């Protein structure tokens, strides 16, 4: 009944859907939340070719805008599973079932947790995984950011609009982030560093975070310091629960594809951050997306 | 002396250069003409995520704009060869030589010729490979477009702004172009079709094209019809002469890479239309580009 169903309307899925529709495939794009995925949790995007800078949510809007006019069927759905029935597949949401000849999985990735005490307890209360969502709640605080990669360092620079200071805690003596972002963090006066450290505990009164305990990973020295907010940016986990049974994920849960975005399962493709890969960006999400769209077109042509 | 040299400033090369520079690689971007590559020969771009529609040359400008500010070294150069010297490489232009630790080849593809009589003769004179360049020269003419793929059909729709009529000649009974583009050509009143045919000869007086002779590929019937212009869009050839000796091309001249954009030759990567692949688009040029940039960064880190 559908030629293609695409799960997830971040930039990879939205690009796929734009292509399947231009190919006049009967196209359903399922999204559990707001179109844009992670781009909506991004303050400022500087490295998407075509725009010198653009707010995450504006880029999200621009990419979603033409889909309806192309005849993409945009629907709300949280997908809970996928059943393969050889010459077709069933996708199960909370309420519905959807029959399709092919699937492009574009469900991305989610924040990795610290799994330390106080992290859950203070979830609503000074612990955040999204600077653009929560930063203004921490005006004039001492903010802590945990992590050393592009999200930690970039989101720390953003958080300097709000905090008295922002401190980046990284578990080595060298950041992983892009040099230009590093260099911008080195130079920014409101950014402090706690190198070679990991957090051990988040502590607070009954209402909110007050301090963090942390350990130096070369000496074992333990320190506790006061902070009003903690943003955690220590990497990503796949968002692929609905396919765990299917034999298409690696040991860590990422979807395995070949270079044409194909899983084991004919007619089931995956794109973007959810795939097992190293280089997660909007550019590679968009490319993966277009590639999947084309492979699905071909797959459906042969069916 | 360079960490990376990128040859070609179309969207693939310009994306690569934006990434190498953000990685603070000492970056040279060589281009023989105007930044934008094929996008400059494109009238209207509708399928680049982020823009609902945008003129080829405007998208070119936007992608070129931030490169200087990132510290990309933008230079004029036509590259004639590349010499590998193990731990470095030499790139030869017409006038200069450039030493670099890595190369990202992003030189794209060029129009395939018909190789029929009158095609060279009337080159300046009613034969064109670029509708956006020459279309207005053919106001009120009967225009012919040869080809059945996305460029023929899309450039024919554009040419309808200028011609009395535009006729698409395709060598089968089914277009290769995207269905949406087909459907738009079917519906457009100024677009005629000559199906199942190939052109045999382009004829003219001393000053210009007047007619085309063509053959039906199922019956052998030969017909000659009057036209004032002919646009030829019958596919692409690689632009990779400077590496022919190097053992990195297939029998047709396309550069062979793996999925991380690597050739045989360590430190020599290729991206975009110049690679051996099937799916040539701005989205996949941009993705390939970002991927190469990252692989080059890593390659140079290990050197
Ligand atoms: C703070 C931050 C800043 C970033 N900045 C940049 C940047 O500047 N440049 C850059 O190139 N990259 C950036 N990235 C990375 C980039 O945003 C991602 O690589 C990209 O968004 C991946 O797109 P995707 O479509 O694969 O996944 P996502 O954007 O993660 O989209 C996945 C979508 O699937 C939906 N979903 C998940 N599960 C289900 C389900 N079961 N059913 C229905 N829907 C589901 C989600 O709601 C989501 O909308 C940044 C990331 C972060 C966190
Ligand atoms: C008419 C037309 C319309 C199109 N429309 C679309 C569209 O709507 N959407 C879409 O996604 N795709 C479209 N495409 C395809 C798209 O433009 C290409 O896939 C894309 O431009 C490839 O980019 P690239 O950087 O790999 O190569 P190119 O854009 O071809 O750039 C290669 C660059 O290398 C330079 N160069 C070549 N040799 C040398 C040398 N020896 N030394 C120095 N410089 C050199 C050239 O000057 C050129 O600037 C279209 C193509 C055409 C012809
Ligand atoms: N502008 C952009 O292009 C942009 C922006 C944001 C994200 N992204 C991309 O998105 C993907 C994910 O980015 P990310 O930064 O969220 O994740 P990431 O690249 O996995 O980096 C997470 C960082 O946190 C560190 N870390 C892990 N556990 C830690 C702990 N317990 N304490 C302190 N530090 C810890 C890691 O250490 P190690 O480094 O030692 O492993 C790493 O530096 C990447 O591919 C990234 O490039 C891109
Ligand atoms: N909007 C876009 O996304 C866009 C726009 C333009 C180009 N592109 C991409 O650019 C790449 C190249 O596009 P293209 O259209 O230039 O080339 P193409 O896809 O190779 O198509 C060339 C077309 O011309 C036909 N042909 C070849 N020789 C012929 C002859 N002698 N007489 C009549 N017809 C002949 C081919 O026939 P067969 O079909 O029988 O082989 C084919 O249909 C493609 O990957 C394309 O998708 C994309």
Numbering used by the authors:
A (entry chain A), B (entry chain A): 5 to 307
Lines quoted from the article behind this entry:
The recycling of Trx is catalysed by the homodimeric flavoprotein thioredoxin reductase (TrxR) that utilizes electrons from NADPH which are shuttled through a tightly bound FAD co-enzyme and a redox active dithiol motif. The overall structure of LlTrxR is similar to other low molecular weight (LMW) TrxRs317 with a dimeric organization in which each monomer is composed of NADPH and FAD binding domains. While investigating the biochemical properties of L. lactis TrxR (LlTrxR) we discovered that the enzyme is susceptible to photo-inactivation by visible light in an oxygen-dependent manner.
The LlTrxR structures were obtained mainly in the FR conformation, which was unexpected since all available structures of LMW TrxR from other organisms are in the FO conformation, except for the engineered complex between EcTrxR and EcTrx6. The propensity of LlTrxR to crystallize in the FR conformation may indicate that the enzyme is stabilized in this conformation. Superposition of LlTrxR Cα-atoms with the structure of EcTrxR36, gives RMSD of 0.426 Å and 1.137 Å for the enzymes in FR and FO conformation, respectively. The relative orientation of the structures thus matches perfectly with the E. coli enzyme and consolidates the catalytic model proposed by Waksman et al. (1994) where the NADPH domain rotates 66° relative to the FAD domain in order to switch between the FO and FR conformations in the catalytic cycle. Met43 positioned on the si-face bends away from the isoalloxazine towards Pro15 and the sidechains of Met18 and Met67 and as a consequence a pocket on the si-face is formed. In the space between the β-carbon of Met43 and the isoalloxazine ring (7.2–7.4 Å distance to N10 and N5) a well-defined electron density appears, assigned to a water molecule perfectly centered above the central ring of the isoalloxazine. This water molecule is present in all structures listed in Table 1.
